[PDB]
Amino acid sequence: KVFGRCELAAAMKRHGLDNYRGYSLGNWVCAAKFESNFNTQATNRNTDGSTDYGILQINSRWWCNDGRTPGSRNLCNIPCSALLSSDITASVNCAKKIVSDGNGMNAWVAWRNRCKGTDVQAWIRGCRL
Numbered sequence: 001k002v003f004g005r006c007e008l009a010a011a012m013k014r015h016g017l018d019n020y021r022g023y024s025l026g027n028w029v030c031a032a033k034f035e036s037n038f039n040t041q042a043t044n045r046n047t048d049g050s051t052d053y054g055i056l057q058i059n060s061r062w063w064c065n066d067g068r069t070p071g072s073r074n075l076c077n078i079p080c081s082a083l084l085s086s087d088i089t090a091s092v093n094c095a096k097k098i099v100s101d102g103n104g105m106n107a108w109v110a111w112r113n114r115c116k117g118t119d120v121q122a123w124i125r126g127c128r129l
């Protein structure tokens, strides 16, 4: 599923991401735009053999299991395929553990390089929340 911008903001809002660990809703919408282009089915293979999954491109190196990342971890206790569903619950639950891990939203490289320090409120402007 390819979400709309305001549609995804509403979904993230009701799942409790607004101001979660201090990060306003606009930071989460901006990250998803540049990580996945709002597509829940996005995947990308990394040079070390891990794979990034779903709307926030969660990495199998640490957070989910796909059976093909030798020596990896499954800290979210979830199959990586569950992060590709049209319902964002699984990604949001795993995202909350990721952001609390110590580096904050810097864990998302596209957030640090394209959203951090910008006017992120413009991503939720005009949305029925």
Ligand SMILES: C[N+](C)(C)CCO
Pocket (backbone or CB within 6 Å): 062, 101
């Ligand atoms: C901080 N990392 C996610 C890289 C490892 C956690 O043990």
Ligand SMILES: C[N+](C)(C)CCO
Pocket (backbone or CB within 6 Å): 122, 123, 124, 125
């Ligand atoms: C922030 N953008 C202008 C790129 C999206 C519309 O709000």
Ligand SMILES: [Cl-]
Pocket (backbone or CB within 6 Å): 001, 002, 039, 040, 041
């Ligand atoms: Cl899709």
Ligand SMILES: [Cl-]
Pocket (backbone or CB within 6 Å): 003, 004, 005, 006, 007, 008
């Ligand atoms: Cl929308």
Ligand SMILES: [Cl-]
Pocket (backbone or CB within 6 Å): 014
């Ligand atoms: Cl609900």
Ligand SMILES: [Cl-]
Pocket (backbone or CB within 6 Å): 022, 023, 024, 027
């Ligand atoms: Cl904030």
Ligand SMILES: [Cl-]
Pocket (backbone or CB within 6 Å): 024, 025, 026, 027, 120, 121, 124
């Ligand atoms: Cl915001």
Ligand SMILES: [Cl-]
Pocket (backbone or CB within 6 Å): 053, 054, 055, 056, 057, 058, 083, 091
């Ligand atoms: Cl994701």
Ligand SMILES: [Cl-]
Pocket (backbone or CB within 6 Å): 069, 070, 071, 072
């Ligand atoms: Cl293994």
Ligand SMILES: [Cl-]
Pocket (backbone or CB within 6 Å): 072, 073, 074, 075
């Ligand atoms: Cl584990």
Ligand SMILES: [Cl-]
Pocket (backbone or CB within 6 Å): 065, 066, 078, 079, 080
């Ligand atoms: Cl699994």
Ligand SMILES: [Cl-]
Pocket (backbone or CB within 6 Å): 011, 086, 087, 088, 089
């Ligand atoms: Cl949803």
Ligand SMILES: [Cl-]
Pocket (backbone or CB within 6 Å): 021, 022, 103, 104, 105
């Ligand atoms: Cl932080």
Ligand SMILES: [Cl-]
Pocket (backbone or CB within 6 Å): 062, 098, 107
């Ligand atoms: Cl990470």
Ligand SMILES: [Cl-]
Pocket (backbone or CB within 6 Å): 124, 125, 126, 127
């Ligand atoms: Cl507004």
Ligand code: NA
Pocket (backbone or CB within 6 Å): 005, 033
């Ligand atoms: Na957009």
